[PDB]
Design a protein around this ligand. Structure first.
Ligand SMILES: Cn1cc(C(F)(F)F)nc1[C@H]1CCCNC1
Lengths: 39, 156
């Protein structure tokens, strides 16, 4: 039995930590909602 | 129960202690999460009950109390923010420039940020604070790193 608990407001925060790259990938999405790499 | 707009943790007491299985967004009276977080089960908010209203395993999304309300889209150029809500930790915003998932049915934005499985459902936002999608359905690439799609539903 699942329950929900508030964690915060949804707002853009100025001067947030900036990280992560931007890869361009060929992918496939199957009927089960699973993504896979196309090679 | 609490129907205030915002980001929420999805918890369960079925396992050891209280475990965070995911995250969701309450907007316009509707709770939005990823399908793999709840598997379509009913939710509790204090003393109230939230029933599933719409869901789709392939899109990996589900809405409660009403139809999917989130309609903003990534502009394809700007940085975005993942409002990550990790298990046992405070909500935090991470800014990033999304990559692209290229499919036979079109291109989707993607965020190359790795967080525990229980962070699934955390919202991805634009500079106006609008939810452009949810985090947590992705792939492991050649490097071994994790990349999530920016998953957005359709507002009827
Ligand atoms: C963020 N996330 C979501 C899920 C899944 F369970 F598949 F839904 N798995 C992850 C990450 C967890 C840390 C290692 N890399 C994958």
């Amino acid at each position: 039995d699942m329950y929900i608990e508030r964690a915060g407001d949804i707002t853009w925060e100025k001067d947030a930590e900036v990280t992560g790259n931007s890869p361009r990938l060929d992918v496939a999405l199957d009927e089960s909602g699973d993504f896979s790499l196309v090679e | 129960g609490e129907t205030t707009d915002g980001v929420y943790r999805v918890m369960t007491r079925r396992l050891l202690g209280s475990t965070q299985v995911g995250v969701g967004v309450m907007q316009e009276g509707v709770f939005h999460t990823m399908w793999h977080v709840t598997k379509g089960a009913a939710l509790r908010s204090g003393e109230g009950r939230l029933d599933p209203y719409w869901g789709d395993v392939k899109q990996d999304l589900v809405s409660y109390c009403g139809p999917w309300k989130l309609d903003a889209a990534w502009d394809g150029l700007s940085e975005v923010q993942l409002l990550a809500v990790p298990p046992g930790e405070r909500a935090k915003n991470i800014q990033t420039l999304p990559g692209i998932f290229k499919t036979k049915d079109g291109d989707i934005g993607a965020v190359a940020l790795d967080y525990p499985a229980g962070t699934s459902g955390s919202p991805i936002l634009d500079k106006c604070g609008r939810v452009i999608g949810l985090y947590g359905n992705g792939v492991v690439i050649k490097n071994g790193s994790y990349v999530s799609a920016i998953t957005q539903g359709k507002r009827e």
